[PDB]
Amino acid sequence: SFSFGGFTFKRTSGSSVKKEEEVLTGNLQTLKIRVHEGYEEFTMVGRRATAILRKATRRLIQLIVSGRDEQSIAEAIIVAMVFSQEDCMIKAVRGDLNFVNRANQRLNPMHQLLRHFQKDAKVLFQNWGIESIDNVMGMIGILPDMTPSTEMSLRGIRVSKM
Ligand SMILES: O=C(O)[C@H]1[C@H]2CC[C@H](CC2)[C@@H]1Nc1nc(-c2c[nH]c3ncc(F)cc23)ncc1F
Ligand SMILES: [Br-]
Ligand SMILES: [Br-]
């Protein structure tokens, strides 16, 4: 078990190895991240949302989420998008150079990224991508404005209807 973003993560299948990599954020800062390489599935358990996250190397494959309300679901989706380590999430960082502003505090870069997007996820959601969805009974899309859609969704994301 490990906690991230206030969700308890448990790997339910697969495996990964860690490759240290320097990535360039949207505001041109460098982070040294432990990139997980391989196919994995995780459960995410929160107080107000639960999800199943299937991913590969720097790629969200599927996120199925259920939650108390749109804000709780969005909270789970932000964490999953950061945890994915996707390039479009890295490139969505904007604003003050506040990863650079911290030198000898030697903070965890994945925690820095999540804390950044917890301030304002609009650019993260607008740059993630949307796709057309199959009509799966009990499941619905969620758009970048966090409204439901039966026809389109944020890429790889589906909501299991309360
Ligand atoms: O510093 C780390 O590497 C920590 C922080 C940032 C993400 C996880 C939770 C906090 C990470 N811890 C763990 N990650 C992982 C892990 C497996 N696949 C992953 N893919 C992406 C990722 F991002 C983390 C992981 N497994 C065990 C862990 F214990
Ligand atoms: Br890291
Ligand atoms: Br469209």
Among all chains, which residue has been given the structure tokens 């999540």?
114
Which residues have any ligand 1 atom within 6 Å of their CB?
Answer: 2, 4, 16, 34, 36, 40, 83, 85, 108, 110
Q: Which two tokens stand for residue 106?
A: 């030697």
- What residue's CA is closest to ligand 1, atom 20? 36
Total residues found in the chain within this entry: 162
Largest distance between two CA atoms of the chain: 51
DSSP 120: -
Element (H, E) at 22: strand 17-24
Among all chains, which residue has been given the structure tokens 């969700």?
7
Method used to solve the structure: X-ray
Across-strand partners of 62?
A: 54
Neighbouring C-beta atoms of residue 58, cutoff 10 Å = 18
- Residue 105, classified by CB atoms within 10 Å of its CB into exposed (0-12), middle (13-18) or buried (19+), is exposed
What b/e sequence results for 121-150 when a residue is b if at least 16 CB atoms lie within 10 Å of its CB, and e otherwise?
Answer: bebbbebbebeebeeeeeebbbebebeebe
Q: Nearest-CA neighbor of 156 among 137, 136, 124, 129?
A: 129
Alpha carbon 24 to its chain's center: 17
Number of H helices, E strands in the chain: 4, 12
End-to-end CA gap in the chain: 26
Alpha carbons 156 and 65: distance in angstroms, whole number: 11
Across-strand partners of 53?
A: 42, 63
- What residue's CA is closest to ligand 1, atom 28? 2
User: 3-state DSSP call for residue 102?
Assistant: coil
Question: Domain tally for the chain?
Answer: 1
Enclosing domain of residue 28 = 1-162
Q: At 44, which amino acid appears?
A: M
Paired sense of beta strands 59-67 and 148-149, if any: unpaired
